């Protein structure tokens, strides 16, 4: 299969520059171009520009052929956009997209979150959302995660390292007074479990490589 | 410099309806493209060359259009259905996309399970408390979650978040946490969270006292 594996995501300061990565892979990478999409809550989807890894012609969002430089490196199937001299505006999350040179875009990558601030990055604290029977509505239990006060963008939550799936609710972050963000994982479990069956989240929180797992049992 | 326009920006469906989006630019093009993007995840090819199914896309799925008008549609919507569409014109630099069409499917009226959760003995220890109101799988949309701290109704205290219309069940579900120092939490001693929606008759409270 086609796989675009970007670079994880940024925390970048006000006037610095910064560089995201594609990794292709399952495709002859010289047969087709690269290209760069831009995702904001601002403008929705922008095409950057692409870059024909065979020679290195680019073509360009004239909006953004300053901002954007794009360049190739066969031998490990990877192309880079920089973005130089960045601004709060180009906070965004950034796609690679393969296309033939003729054709329209048909893969996309998973995409990188960027952050543009001046503000240090925060972990999150975990706290667990124990299951009472205040949490029991008719023999169903629902338990959860609380994580809090972390910056920036995003953060991953899985439950027992992604054997629970069913019934698991991760809601958007919100943005707290503090200006950092709060989030919220929750599962509607079986009550005939929570006396025998662990629940374990994972929190991994990237930009500052903080990684929790933390036991959620009743009371 | 190629603007283009899609009619519906947001449209709500029922199943099996036929509903058709447009896609008008602001001069005329050879080919439309159609990317479908669920939030969180990146877009997916869904129909190029205006009216070729990308592989994958089911065949109730279909595209038409001619210079600058175009639309897309699909025979009898389903749950899976429910996403963002954008439109995507590559005729000349720079390329564009639209503004996107978002599809909610329409389901029968849904009242949501109220749960309530105290704060952590951990979070205690750091100084602040946080109590949370689950609100969990409803329908409609609208739902008015209202914290009041021994009957005192708060304001200004809480934030809430609502995940995205499932596509298993379609329902919504609402995440309401309210805030206080260590020192208010206790303060007081009833918490409770007050839930108004469609499908309740009367407005439903979860509570519990400190201890």
Not at chain 1, 161 to 185: C, D, E, I, K, N
């Amino acid at each position: 299969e086609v796989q675009l594996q970007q670079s994880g995501p940024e925390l970048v300061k006000p006037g610095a520059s910064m560089k995201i990565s594609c990794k292709a892979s399952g495709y002859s990478f010289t047969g087709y171009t690269m290209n760069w999409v831009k995702q904001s809550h601002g403008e929705n989807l922008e095409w950057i520009g692409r870059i024909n890894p065979h020679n290195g012609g680019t073509d360009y969002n004239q909006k953004f052929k300053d901002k954007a430089p794009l360049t190739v490196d066969k031998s490990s199937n990877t192309a880079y956009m920089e973005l130089l001299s960045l601004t709060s505006g180009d906070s965004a999350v950034y796609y690679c997209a393969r296309g033939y040179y003729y054709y329209s875009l048909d893969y996309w990558g998973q995409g990188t979150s960027v952050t543009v601030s001046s503000a240090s990055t925060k972990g999150p604290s975990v706290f667990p959302l124990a299951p009472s029977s205040k949490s029991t509505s008719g023999g169903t239990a629902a338990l959860g995660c609380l994580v809090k006060d972390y910056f920036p963008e995003p953060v991953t939550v899985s439950w027992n390292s992604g054997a629970l799936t069913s019934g698991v609710h991760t809601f958007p972050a919100v943005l707290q007074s503090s200006g950092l963000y709060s989030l919220s994982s929750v599962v509607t479990v079986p009550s005939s479990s929570l006396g025998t069956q662990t629940y374990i989240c994972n929190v991994n929180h990237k930009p500052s490589n903080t990684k929790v797992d933390k036991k959620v049992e009743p009371k | 410099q190629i603007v283009l326009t899609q009619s519906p920006a947001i449209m709500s469906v029922s199943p099996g309806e036929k509903v058709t989006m447009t896609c008008s630019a602001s001069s005329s093009i050879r080919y439309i493209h159609w990317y479908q993007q669920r939030p969180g995840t990146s877009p997916k090819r869904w129909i190029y060359d205006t009216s070729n199914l990308a592989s994958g896309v089911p065949a109730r799925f279909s595209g038409s259009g001619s210079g600058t008008s175009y639309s897309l549609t699909i025979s009898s919507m389903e749950a899976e259905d429910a996403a963002t569409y954008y439109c995507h014109q590559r005729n000349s630099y720079p390329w564009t996309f639209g503004g996107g069409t978002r599809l909610e499917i329409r389901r029968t009226v849904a009242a949501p399970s109220v749960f309530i959760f105290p704060p952590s003995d951990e979070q205690l220890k750091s100084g602040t408390a946080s109590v949370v109101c689950l609100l969990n799988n409803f329908y409609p949309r609208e739902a008015k979650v209202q914290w009041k701290v021994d009957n005192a109704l708060q304001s200004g205290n809480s934030q809430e978040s609502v995940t995205e219309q499932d596509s298993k069940d379609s329902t919504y579900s609402l995440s309401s946490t309210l805030t206080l120092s260590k020192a208010d939490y206790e303060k007081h001693k009833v918490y409770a969270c007050e839930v108004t929606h469609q499908g309740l008759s009367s407005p439903v409270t979860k509570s519990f006292n400190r201890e």
